[PDB]
Amino acid sequence: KPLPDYVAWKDADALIVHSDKTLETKRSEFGTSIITPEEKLYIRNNVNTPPESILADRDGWKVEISGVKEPRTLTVAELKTLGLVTAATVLQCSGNGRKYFKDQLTGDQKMSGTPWTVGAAGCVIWSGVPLKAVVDALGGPAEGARFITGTGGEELPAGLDPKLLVVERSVPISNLDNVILAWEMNGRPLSLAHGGPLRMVVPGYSGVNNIKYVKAVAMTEVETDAKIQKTSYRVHALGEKGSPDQPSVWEQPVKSWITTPHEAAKAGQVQIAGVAFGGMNACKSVEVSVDGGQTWQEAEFIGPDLGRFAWRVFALSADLARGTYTLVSRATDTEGNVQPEETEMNGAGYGHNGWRAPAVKLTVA
Amino acid sequence: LPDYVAWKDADALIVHSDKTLETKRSEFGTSIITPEEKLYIRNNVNTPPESILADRDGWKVEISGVKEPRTLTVAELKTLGLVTAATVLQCSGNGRKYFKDQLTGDQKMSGTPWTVGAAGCVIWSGVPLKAVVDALGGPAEGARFITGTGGEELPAGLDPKLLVVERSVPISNLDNVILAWEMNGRPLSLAHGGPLRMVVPGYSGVNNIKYVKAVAMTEVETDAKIQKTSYRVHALGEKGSPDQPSVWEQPVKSWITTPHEAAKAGQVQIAGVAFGGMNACKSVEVSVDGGQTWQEAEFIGPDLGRFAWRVFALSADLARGTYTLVSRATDTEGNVQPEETEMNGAGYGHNGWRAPAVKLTVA
Ligand code: MSS
Ligand code: MSS
């Protein structure tokens, strides 16, 4: 399957093209430098990408800020005057790990959606303006405000109900201090593929909440009742419809997976590495096992600490005999949350973080 | 753009020569890490052919000056350890333009007139030299230097010492030195020293040997031209000689990176990059009036370590006019940038705060 027009610049050999809206990073392509190369970063769109014309005048891009004491519309040019913040986060789809839930289906049980393994995730550095600074410039939040609600800038088709298609998401207002209106990713102007010219980055939260080409940010008393917030991206049992009484895919859980080696290794000393994060919290420690979870050893963190929303690279130096190993990692966050062996089933297949499913088969020769 | 860097971003680079590409001041970004396609280039000799990347894991490195000396492949090196570190990769020439501006009368200085773009901050990943040396029994008794040899093919007939890119640094750097196969998450490019590079954190660019084919623990510095007489700190009109200081440790330095030319009157975000070389940057001051008044700046983004640089920013409310933006950094040991750097003949190691001032026209 060929790389779509809007991501022709990406690295075809590093990606699994599930659909034109769905590209997964290969497990062997994450690297050990923490930061995921831009041309290898995964893609997940719910609707078609806007035209490249929206990047012609980046500084002219408009964002309606409401739910504040002094509401008005500000340009990216203006936003650039109000502040500057840089932060590393784990950008991951709630769908990441869905394949593993599908593997657990018995009988006539069925689950739709992209069968992501581990490649629907990356760690990237964002740069932009803190939402707090933007809200404080406009007098602060309106009294009684409970949510940050961001609206994707895609053109909606005329005639149809906009709420059925709009990419609009709501997160609690306690995230205000963390939220970034970002125009830059990994040192470059933000690409169209990843939400340029401006993206609402919500650290620690799942991909869906990080709104590409954000054209509106509202401090609201209620969640948006858009389809994508009200019934979609909800955690429910098999056979249940989604509904707003259920937990939405917000905070990311503690998670990890092994990234290297991916298939083969020579007998003797082998460096086993991977990535680990705690979502809202930093990863405190990681254990690695070469025998599918029977025996565990403490791993070392590799590289610098990019913050509690980022991931760490970890490594275990293992001396291995000839054979077929089953490499798995189990991470713990700073609050004591640890990955389970398996994740409790849910109907849409969101938020997998089990350690057994994503095991790497290492043939040691 | 030359063949070996055709993948780079032409609009982000100033092409001085086929061996010399400078990053534009407006292209550093505020994410700390310098985009690979925008990273500067400085070669002393022609780049090897792209064929050396065909078999990366098969690339050979002669390790000597150890108890049990032998040649190891990149494949083997990958088994011995793993390390990741962010460093400031900067040419000793960076800032040479500013030294040339200080020349009076019939004084002359050769070399690329770099301003501030002969530098980047990048994440390396590879194997610690210490682990490689420990696997081979440790350093030979009496070893004083880490000497690395560039893998370029030398022309036959000519004295190899006149052209070889071979550099020596003190052995106290052993714990920091990385034999790196990866940069910013990707396999290391040919342009930046792939398939394997000797990264010496805190030291100037010249010491970070591309396509390293030999690493020796030696009792003496290599007497190669590039080490013995070149890259030495001397006065105007003096020849270089090995009694003089070599361009080793980087001094505390900074420069403003944004905005680069224009801004609207009112609130303006003034940002830049700062590092202490061997030491972390502790603090940065920014001035909008060419050094008459100073204000403390904030650090922006995460701390990538003592060898890296920090992004800093000052939020300034500015009236209409023409400002002169300058930054002055201090390291964790109290070393601070001077206004100007003492002159030296080859124009190495500029770190003054006045010369690299940005002219901001506020409308
Ligand atoms: N505007 C917008 N935004 C947005 C969207 C769309 O569609 N639109 N998607 C989501 C999702 S869903 Mo699941 O949870 S993941 C995800 C993400 C992805 O990212 P990238 O593509 O950059 O990777 O994004 C996010 N944001
Ligand atoms: N092998 C080799 N390496 C090498 C060389 C040569 O020539 N060769 N150069 C130096 C120098 S000098 Mo003055 O100090 S700066 C510098 C650097 C740069 O890097 P990039 O190009 O990658 O950026 O490199 C380094 N390394």
Numbering used by the authors:
A (entry chain A): 35 to 399
B (entry chain B): 37 to 399
Quote from the publication.
Here, we have investigated an electron transfer complex involving the periplasmic SorT sulfite dehydrogenase from the α-Proteobacterium Sinorhizobium meliloti, which represents a structurally uncharacterized type of SOE, and its electron acceptor, the c-type cytochrome SorU. Electrons derived from sulfite oxidation are passed on to the SorU cytochrome, and likely then to cytochrome oxidase, as S. meliloti is capable of sulfite respiration.
The structure shows two homodimeric assemblies per asymmetric unit, which is in agreement with the quaternary structure as determined by MALLS. Unexpectedly however, within the SorT homodimer the protomers are oriented in a head-to-tail orientation, a subunit arrangement that has not been previously observed in structures of sulfite-oxidizing enzymes. Nevertheless, the fold of the SorT monomers is similar to those of other SOEs, comprising a central ‘SUOX-fold’ domain that harbors the Mo active site and a ‘dimerization’ domain. Within the SorT dimer, the subunit interface involves both the 'SUOX-fold' and the ‘dimerization’ domains, resulting in a buried surface area of ~1280 Å2 per monomer, which is approximately 9% of the solvent-accessible surface of each monomer. SorT was crystallized by hanging drop vapor diffusion with drops consisting of equal volumes (2 μL) of protein and crystallization solution (0.1 M HEPES pH 7.5, 8% ethylene glycol, 0.1 M manganese (II) chloride tetrahydrate and 17.5% PEG 10,000) at 20°C. Crystals were cryoprotected in reservoir solution with 30% glycerol before flash-cooling in liquid nitrogen. The resulting model was refined by iterative cycles of amplitude based twin refinement (using twin operators H, K, L and –H, -K, L with estimated twin fractions of 0.495 and 0.505 respectively) within REFMAC, interspersed with manual inspection and correction against calculated electron density maps using COOT. The refinement of the model converged with residuals R = 0.208 and Rfree = 0.239.
